[PDB]
From a paper:
Lipins are magnesium-dependent phosphatidic acid phosphatases (PAPs) that catalyze the dephosphorylation of the membrane lipid phosphatidic acid (PA) to produce diacylglycerol (DAG). Phospholipid synthesis and fat storage as triglycerides are regulated by lipin phosphatidic acid phosphatases (PAPs), whose enzymatic PAP function requires association with cellular membranes.
We refer to this construct as the M-Lipxtal domain. The M-Lipxtal domain could be purified without detergent and was extremely stable with a melting temperature of 65 °C. The structure of the M-Lipxtal domain of mouse lipin 1 was determined to resolutions of 1.5 Å and 1.9 Å in two unique space groups. Two additional peptides present in the crystallized M-Lipxtal domain were also protected. These peptides mapped to the same surface, which suggests that the core of the M-Lipxtal domain can also interact with membranes but is not the major determinant of membrane binding.
Residue numbers in the entry:
A (entry chain A), B (entry chain A): 461 to 548
């Protein structure tokens, strides 16, 4: 019931570029890849796809914590506020 | 099937103290509390309980990202490695 999550190293947020599905998919991070290098989570090019939206880690973090701690997403208005504070 | 997650502002990790269940529960963070102040995620006293273990946010982050991106936890040996790198 929760929105799906996927991660990629395609980058493109800090420079404010329009991210393509195929670019995201081409650099998707696998479980084995992440387990072998958990520091991927600190890579500035990490993009987190939540449902149909692309976020950086700093914005995705509170969204993902709320989903797993409370089994429901944050309110849309809260997400928009977090984006204003933590998205590039 | 995934381990349960809960969050609290009880603190006690950076000073290396032995955290009590009741202290964690007394300062548990609610959904409304987190939605009203998502910056709680940056509070140094934030403790993340994953299953039966207490982590700080920097350690919990890759564990929670892997659970939601891959629908399974990281290997125990990987978690132990992350703890050595990111736990206080």
């Amino acid at each position: 019931d929760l929105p799906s999550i996927a991660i990629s190293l395609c980058g493109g947020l800090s420079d404010h570029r329009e991210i393509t599905k195929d670019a995201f998919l081409e650099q998707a991070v696998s479980y084995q890849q992440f387990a072998d290098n958990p520091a991927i989570i600190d890579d500035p090019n990490l993009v987190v796809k939540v449902g149909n939206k692309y976020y950086n880690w700093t914005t995705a973090a509170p969204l993902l914590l709320a989903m797993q701690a409370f089994q429901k997403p944050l309110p849309k208005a809260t997400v928009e506020s977090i984006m204003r504070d933590k998205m590039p």
